[PDB]
Amino acid sequence: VVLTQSPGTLALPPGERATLSCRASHRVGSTYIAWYQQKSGQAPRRLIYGASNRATDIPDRFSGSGSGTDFTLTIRRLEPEDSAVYYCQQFSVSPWTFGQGTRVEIKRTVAAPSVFIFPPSDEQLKSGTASVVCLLNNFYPREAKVQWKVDNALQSGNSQESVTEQDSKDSTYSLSSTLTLSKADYEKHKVYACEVTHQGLSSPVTKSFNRGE
Amino acid sequence: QVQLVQSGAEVKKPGASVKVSCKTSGYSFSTYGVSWVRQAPGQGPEWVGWISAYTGITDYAQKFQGRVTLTTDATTATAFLDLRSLRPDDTATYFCARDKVQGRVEVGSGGRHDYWGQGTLVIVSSASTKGPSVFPLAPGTAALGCLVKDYFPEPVTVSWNSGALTSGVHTFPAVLQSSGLYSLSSVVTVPSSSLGTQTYICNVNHKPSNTKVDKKVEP
Amino acid sequence: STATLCLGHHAVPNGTLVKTITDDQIEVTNATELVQSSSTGKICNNPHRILDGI
Amino acid sequence: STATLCLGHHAVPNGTLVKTITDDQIEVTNATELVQSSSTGKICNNPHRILDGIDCTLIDALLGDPHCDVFQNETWDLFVERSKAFSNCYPYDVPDYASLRSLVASS
Amino acid sequence: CISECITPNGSIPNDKPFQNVNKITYGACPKYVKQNTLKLATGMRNVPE
Amino acid sequence: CISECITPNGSIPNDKPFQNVNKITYGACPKYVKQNTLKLATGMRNVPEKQT
Amino acid sequence: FIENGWEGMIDGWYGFRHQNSEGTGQAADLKSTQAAIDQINGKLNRVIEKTNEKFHQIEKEFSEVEGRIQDLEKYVEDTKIDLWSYNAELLVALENQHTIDLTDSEMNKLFEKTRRQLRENAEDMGNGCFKIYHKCDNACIESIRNGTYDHDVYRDEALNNRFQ
Amino acid sequence: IENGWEGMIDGWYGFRHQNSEGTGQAADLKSTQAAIDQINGKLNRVIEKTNEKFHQIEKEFSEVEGRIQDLEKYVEDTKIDLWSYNAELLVALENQHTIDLTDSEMNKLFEKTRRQLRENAEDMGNGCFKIYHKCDNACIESIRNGTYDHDVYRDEALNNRFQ
Amino acid sequence: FIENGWEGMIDGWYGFRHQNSEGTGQAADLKSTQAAIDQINGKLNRVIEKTNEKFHQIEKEFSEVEGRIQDLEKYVEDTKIDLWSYNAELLVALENQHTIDLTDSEMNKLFEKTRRQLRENAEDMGNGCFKIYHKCDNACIESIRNGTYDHDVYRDEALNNRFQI
Ligand SMILES: *[C@@H]1O[C@H](CO)[C@@H](O)[C@H](O)[C@H]1NC(C)=O
């Protein structure tokens, strides 16, 4: 019994309506369906049971319905609180099965990244390698490029980046890329610079630093 | 009230097996079964099995059968999960949750996964454990942090001032290096006036290597 | 010493799920579809005399 | 010496009578009622948007009898015509009244 | 209050599959039947000791 | 072609006792039902073998 | 077999009442209890699985006499009612005759399970009891109840009290 | 029989024996067809050709007409809803039956086999028999094909069982 | 078991045919007979229990062609008929499958009753008879039939014919 649920992700502004579907490969009692919400880290929190009913302490924005094969969960007026993954699940037929998962991103207004560079620590230097960190903080949307430079020598494939999940308050991501060098190569070049292209910036913006200072 | 406290993250090697506890409370253990669901990082949940605390009956998902054993201890009010012959596939976070109503009248389906465990990470890797190095992330709004570098396996828990500073903190996803280890950043944006008065703490803690290193930052 | 004789029934690697009074789903060896769900999309001119009002 | 072991089922001091194929009454341990037989006597305003025609019929709000002015530009899920309602304007009649009522009602 | 079934006699709860209040209804309602009571058995035959 | 059941959606074969194509039909046709699938069992309960 | 059924059994729905040297005692078989329940449960869930929604229908009460159309609107709605009413009467009746035979078979099945377990160390007294033909203390009794009684053990003892 | 046998492709119900001469398997074709013939005939009743309808009422409409149209739509909806219930109930009943029919067929074959062995064997508890004598392959088919004379192995069996 | 049934049994619906020293003879078990009857009786009563009353309905035959309304009056009445007709076909079918399984179980039950009674003094021949392993004269036979056969009495006799000779 396979639950394919759609759409993949979906991005909608606050005060709009998300409408999530969950088609099942076989017919299923309306009583053996449940919906869950999961913000990464914590465990799944259960929104709806028996396809139709809210579990307790749950706002009425959430509601569910469906007949036999097409089940749907409707969040009636979105909040920034609601950016999460949503799973449908059936437990009529062993094995109890879950859905693919529909992501919900709330689609707020554009926001530019606050760019910060960080030189490598004097404690780290002497231990034998160097790691330059560049931080893009509290921006929207997710799509933001980062490019490195070492005395304008354009770098690639020695940086590596990691993005935060959408924030539940203000609905902004945060990024950190990390340039990794040898203490030998780092103690050879002066100008280390982190150039950032993004929808929020009408033209790219570089923050940089001169080694030693 | 009603809760399910699971055991701390274990780390095991391809051959061996594992056992995960799930302590319950706040409701009478024996009128409700327990469902177990696991979650390969980044993928969605998949079901493992279910056991009744009233009748001792089990239903394992046929994917695991043989490898998996569910039990319950009514005295301590705890359900257990034993998984053998661990593949690296089985690296995941493992949840327990209340499920089915037993004995009692009946229905409809009011739960049926009422309440869940906080989750308990299992890592199946043949590599060595390595503790992290913690480097200061040297600093009108202003930014600072820690850099937790070259450790294995996951997880690393980072907080600030025993948790006294919660606001304006972003702790990033661990990122895998080609060296096999992990690297992890955590940053704070704070007002750039309070500098003399305040100070800061990196409650870095990597428990597969018993490394509690609370190591500090300043310009 | 002695001997053992067992009575059994078959089973198959991929059954099919069906409904009953007591049970929402239950796997059985084989089943059959009772609801005609799709069409050919065209109208057959036999045996019924069709007339196209164009 | 030896021992006695017995298999049995429960029973209860006041069962409930139910019907089957072969017989009219037969006492069972418990049963449940399948027919909703009584009402609260009042109409719940959720989740359905109710609208109380008070002194107006629907057709009178449509046309715009004076006392039915408070209904102008209104919407409803379920309009409720009351027994107490009246008309109090120029005297009229609607050939095919019921059709116009019906069709406005579902608009 | 909340009630997804409305009748002229008033609002009724649709936890049951059938009802006998009024044939006129609106919304998610049980099916009107002539019977005023149908008991469904939820246990075994009751035999005194 | 030959088909003893006609619908607006097109012609359908009446080998089944029920159908879900269209409530408008003409000729020897299955009965229109709201269900889009009803499986009738044509064999016993399927039980996999114990183990060992 | 059992003419009767036990009042005062509140541990569960089916059970064991034993008598040995160590004294009498009682205890419910939870597994075959839930087995009955789970069926009734699911059967019941299918019946009350939420009904249809209906909105703007036809009128069914009328103030004036209209003749032909009204006669038809009343005939349609009456015809409906009568049928649905039959459906409900028949449903309940079937479901009940089944719910009975379901639970009578559950008791029945527990008894057989227990007889196949004792193999040739006991006889059916005729009222749904067993005369176990050996010293069966309380440990032995729960060994039967929880599905572990090894007959190959008390075979010789029992077999001989039975026959000479 | 807490389970059932995969890889039995001779038929639907069978015998798996183990003796001195070795293990082996074989299907009981009579009780197999017995199940089939019922399912077959039940299935034939259901799909026994449905019925023909020609000029009926209209069921789709372009414009809003009120009263008559309201009734034409109520009639056809009411029809559908009922037939739909009939079909749901039918299948459900038929299935619960088709299950209990086939479970009883297995069940019946077992009894047939027990009445045959009379007092020369015991029910192991998992739907097998411990036959208490040397039952080589000739003896086994003698059981399967309904000819096992118990009066023959009585003494042998009876004595291994008790002494 | 009994691959056949007895014609010429007119005492009742289920019975006993014995053979001993004193000769053969037959007799019906009235209690399990009425048991079957009472069920069929009551099942039958519920089916034919008082029907509907109906008075002024719609018209169902017509002289002229009227189009739309008439088309609907006939569709309504045909749709009614077709459903009730299905109800009746299904009813009888169900009721019958049951009436069969009801009576087959009644026989079945009487047989068990009789087996539990004989305890270890007799064996199931395989055709729904018993080989009673002791001198069972006519008194002993009615003792079985009327529910009073004390096995503890013929135990030793029977038990020994069974396990010896
Ligand atoms: C059936 O009894 C249960 C206890 O078993 C009770 O809680 C339930 O509400 C009962 N139903 C009716 C209609 O009395």
JSON list of N, CA and C in Angstrom, two decimals, chain G residues 31-61:
[
{"chain": "G", "resi": 31, "resn": "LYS", "atom": "N", "xyz": [-5.11, -13.11, 24.72]},
{"chain": "G", "resi": 31, "resn": "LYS", "atom": "CA", "xyz": [-4.84, -13.15, 23.33]},
{"chain": "G", "resi": 31, "resn": "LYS", "atom": "C", "xyz": [-6.09, -13.46, 22.53]},
{"chain": "G", "resi": 32, "resn": "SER", "atom": "N", "xyz": [-6.87, -14.41, 22.99]},
{"chain": "G", "resi": 32, "resn": "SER", "atom": "CA", "xyz": [-8.08, -14.75, 22.26]},
{"chain": "G", "resi": 32, "resn": "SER", "atom": "C", "xyz": [-9.17, -13.74, 22.61]},
{"chain": "G", "resi": 33, "resn": "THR", "atom": "N", "xyz": [-9.02, -13.01, 23.71]},
{"chain": "G", "resi": 33, "resn": "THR", "atom": "CA", "xyz": [-9.92, -11.90, 24.00]},
{"chain": "G", "resi": 33, "resn": "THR", "atom": "C", "xyz": [-9.74, -10.79, 22.95]},
{"chain": "G", "resi": 34, "resn": "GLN", "atom": "N", "xyz": [-8.53, -10.27, 22.81]},
{"chain": "G", "resi": 34, "resn": "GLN", "atom": "CA", "xyz": [-8.26, -9.24, 21.81]},
{"chain": "G", "resi": 34, "resn": "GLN", "atom": "C", "xyz": [-8.61, -9.69, 20.42]},
{"chain": "G", "resi": 35, "resn": "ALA", "atom": "N", "xyz": [-8.34, -10.95, 20.09]},
{"chain": "G", "resi": 35, "resn": "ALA", "atom": "CA", "xyz": [-8.76, -11.52, 18.80]},
{"chain": "G", "resi": 35, "resn": "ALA", "atom": "C", "xyz": [-10.24, -11.26, 18.47]},
{"chain": "G", "resi": 36, "resn": "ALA", "atom": "N", "xyz": [-11.12, -11.43, 19.46]},
{"chain": "G", "resi": 36, "resn": "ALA", "atom": "CA", "xyz": [-12.55, -11.16, 19.27]},
{"chain": "G", "resi": 36, "resn": "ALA", "atom": "C", "xyz": [-12.75, -9.68, 19.14]},
{"chain": "G", "resi": 37, "resn": "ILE", "atom": "N", "xyz": [-12.23, -8.94, 20.10]},
{"chain": "G", "resi": 37, "resn": "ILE", "atom": "CA", "xyz": [-12.31, -7.51, 20.07]},
{"chain": "G", "resi": 37, "resn": "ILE", "atom": "C", "xyz": [-11.87, -7.00, 18.70]},
{"chain": "G", "resi": 38, "resn": "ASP", "atom": "N", "xyz": [-10.65, -7.28, 18.27]},
{"chain": "G", "resi": 38, "resn": "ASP", "atom": "CA", "xyz": [-10.14, -6.65, 17.05]},
{"chain": "G", "resi": 38, "resn": "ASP", "atom": "C", "xyz": [-11.08, -6.82, 15.86]},
{"chain": "G", "resi": 39, "resn": "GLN", "atom": "N", "xyz": [-11.79, -7.94, 15.81]},
{"chain": "G", "resi": 39, "resn": "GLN", "atom": "CA", "xyz": [-12.76, -8.14, 14.75]},
{"chain": "G", "resi": 39, "resn": "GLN", "atom": "C", "xyz": [-13.99, -7.24, 14.91]},
{"chain": "G", "resi": 40, "resn": "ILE", "atom": "N", "xyz": [-14.63, -7.30, 16.08]},
{"chain": "G", "resi": 40, "resn": "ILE", "atom": "CA", "xyz": [-15.77, -6.43, 16.39]},
{"chain": "G", "resi": 40, "resn": "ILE", "atom": "C", "xyz": [-15.41, -4.99, 16.15]},
{"chain": "G", "resi": 41, "resn": "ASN", "atom": "N", "xyz": [-14.31, -4.56, 16.74]},
{"chain": "G", "resi": 41, "resn": "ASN", "atom": "CA", "xyz": [-13.72, -3.26, 16.45]},
{"chain": "G", "resi": 41, "resn": "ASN", "atom": "C", "xyz": [-13.72, -2.90, 14.97]},
{"chain": "G", "resi": 42, "resn": "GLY", "atom": "N", "xyz": [-13.06, -3.70, 14.16]},
{"chain": "G", "resi": 42, "resn": "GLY", "atom": "CA", "xyz": [-12.97, -3.37, 12.74]},
{"chain": "G", "resi": 42, "resn": "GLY", "atom": "C", "xyz": [-14.29, -3.40, 11.95]},
{"chain": "G", "resi": 43, "resn": "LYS", "atom": "N", "xyz": [-15.15, -4.33, 12.34]},
{"chain": "G", "resi": 43, "resn": "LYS", "atom": "CA", "xyz": [-16.49, -4.48, 11.78]},
{"chain": "G", "resi": 43, "resn": "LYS", "atom": "C", "xyz": [-17.28, -3.24, 12.11]},
{"chain": "G", "resi": 44, "resn": "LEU", "atom": "N", "xyz": [-17.16, -2.81, 13.34]},
{"chain": "G", "resi": 44, "resn": "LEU", "atom": "CA", "xyz": [-17.87, -1.66, 13.83]},
{"chain": "G", "resi": 44, "resn": "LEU", "atom": "C", "xyz": [-17.36, -0.41, 13.14]},
{"chain": "G", "resi": 45, "resn": "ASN", "atom": "N", "xyz": [-16.04, -0.26, 13.06]},
{"chain": "G", "resi": 45, "resn": "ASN", "atom": "CA", "xyz": [-15.46, 0.84, 12.28]},
{"chain": "G", "resi": 45, "resn": "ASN", "atom": "C", "xyz": [-15.93, 0.96, 10.84]},
{"chain": "G", "resi": 46, "resn": "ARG", "atom": "N", "xyz": [-16.18, -0.16, 10.17]},
{"chain": "G", "resi": 46, "resn": "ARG", "atom": "CA", "xyz": [-16.62, -0.08, 8.79]},
{"chain": "G", "resi": 46, "resn": "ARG", "atom": "C", "xyz": [-18.03, 0.40, 8.74]},
{"chain": "G", "resi": 47, "resn": "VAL", "atom": "N", "xyz": [-18.86, 0.04, 9.72]},
{"chain": "G", "resi": 47, "resn": "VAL", "atom": "CA", "xyz": [-20.27, 0.46, 9.69]},
{"chain": "G", "resi": 47, "resn": "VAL", "atom": "C", "xyz": [-20.42, 1.94, 9.90]},
{"chain": "G", "resi": 48, "resn": "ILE", "atom": "N", "xyz": [-19.74, 2.47, 10.90]},
{"chain": "G", "resi": 48, "resn": "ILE", "atom": "CA", "xyz": [-19.87, 3.88, 11.22]},
{"chain": "G", "resi": 48, "resn": "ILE", "atom": "C", "xyz": [-18.84, 4.73, 10.48]},
{"chain": "G", "resi": 49, "resn": "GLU", "atom": "N", "xyz": [-18.09, 4.15, 9.54]},
{"chain": "G", "resi": 49, "resn": "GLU", "atom": "CA", "xyz": [-17.17, 4.95, 8.71]},
{"chain": "G", "resi": 49, "resn": "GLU", "atom": "C", "xyz": [-18.00, 6.00, 8.06]},
{"chain": "G", "resi": 50, "resn": "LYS", "atom": "N", "xyz": [-17.55, 7.23, 8.24]},
{"chain": "G", "resi": 50, "resn": "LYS", "atom": "CA", "xyz": [-18.41, 8.40, 8.08]},
{"chain": "G", "resi": 50, "resn": "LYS", "atom": "C", "xyz": [-19.25, 8.37, 6.80]},
{"chain": "G", "resi": 51, "resn": "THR", "atom": "N", "xyz": [-20.51, 8.73, 6.99]},
{"chain": "G", "resi": 51, "resn": "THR", "atom": "CA", "xyz": [-21.54, 8.60, 5.98]},
{"chain": "G", "resi": 51, "resn": "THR", "atom": "C", "xyz": [-21.33, 9.62, 4.82]},
{"chain": "G", "resi": 52, "resn": "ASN", "atom": "N", "xyz": [-22.36, 9.82, 4.00]},
{"chain": "G", "resi": 52, "resn": "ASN", "atom": "CA", "xyz": [-22.40, 10.82, 2.92]},
{"chain": "G", "resi": 52, "resn": "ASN", "atom": "C", "xyz": [-22.70, 12.23, 3.45]},
{"chain": "G", "resi": 53, "resn": "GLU", "atom": "N", "xyz": [-22.34, 13.26, 2.66]},
{"chain": "G", "resi": 53, "resn": "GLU", "atom": "CA", "xyz": [-22.83, 14.65, 2.79]},
{"chain": "G", "resi": 53, "resn": "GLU", "atom": "C", "xyz": [-23.83, 14.93, 1.69]},
{"chain": "G", "resi": 54, "resn": "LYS", "atom": "N", "xyz": [-24.88, 15.67, 2.00]},
{"chain": "G", "resi": 54, "resn": "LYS", "atom": "CA", "xyz": [-25.85, 16.09, 1.01]},
{"chain": "G", "resi": 54, "resn": "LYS", "atom": "C", "xyz": [-26.22, 17.53, 1.32]},
{"chain": "G", "resi": 55, "resn": "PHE", "atom": "N", "xyz": [-26.47, 18.31, 0.27]},
{"chain": "G", "resi": 55, "resn": "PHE", "atom": "CA", "xyz": [-26.78, 19.74, 0.42]},
{"chain": "G", "resi": 55, "resn": "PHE", "atom": "C", "xyz": [-28.14, 20.11, -0.15]},
{"chain": "G", "resi": 56, "resn": "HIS", "atom": "N", "xyz": [-28.21, 20.85, -1.27]},
{"chain": "G", "resi": 56, "resn": "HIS", "atom": "CA", "xyz": [-29.51, 21.26, -1.80]},
{"chain": "G", "resi": 56, "resn": "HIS", "atom": "C", "xyz": [-30.20, 20.08, -2.45]},
{"chain": "G", "resi": 57, "resn": "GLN", "atom": "N", "xyz": [-31.24, 19.56, -1.80]},
{"chain": "G", "resi": 57, "resn": "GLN", "atom": "CA", "xyz": [-31.98, 18.42, -2.33]},
{"chain": "G", "resi": 57, "resn": "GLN", "atom": "C", "xyz": [-33.35, 18.90, -2.80]},
{"chain": "G", "resi": 58, "resn": "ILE", "atom": "N", "xyz": [-34.32, 18.00, -2.92]},
{"chain": "G", "resi": 58, "resn": "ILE", "atom": "CA", "xyz": [-35.69, 18.39, -3.22]},
{"chain": "G", "resi": 58, "resn": "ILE", "atom": "C", "xyz": [-36.45, 18.76, -1.96]},
{"chain": "G", "resi": 59, "resn": "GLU", "atom": "N", "xyz": [-37.62, 19.35, -2.13]},
{"chain": "G", "resi": 59, "resn": "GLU", "atom": "CA", "xyz": [-38.46, 19.65, -0.99]},
{"chain": "G", "resi": 59, "resn": "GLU", "atom": "C", "xyz": [-39.19, 18.36, -0.61]},
{"chain": "G", "resi": 60, "resn": "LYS", "atom": "N", "xyz": [-39.48, 18.19, 0.67]},
{"chain": "G", "resi": 60, "resn": "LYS", "atom": "CA", "xyz": [-40.13, 16.96, 1.17]},
{"chain": "G", "resi": 60, "resn": "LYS", "atom": "C", "xyz": [-41.33, 17.22, 2.05]},
{"chain": "G", "resi": 61, "resn": "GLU", "atom": "N", "xyz": [-41.60, 18.47, 2.45]},
{"chain": "G", "resi": 61, "resn": "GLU", "atom": "CA", "xyz": [-42.87, 18.84, 3.09]},
{"chain": "G", "resi": 61, "resn": "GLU", "atom": "C", "xyz": [-43.51, 19.85, 2.18]}
]
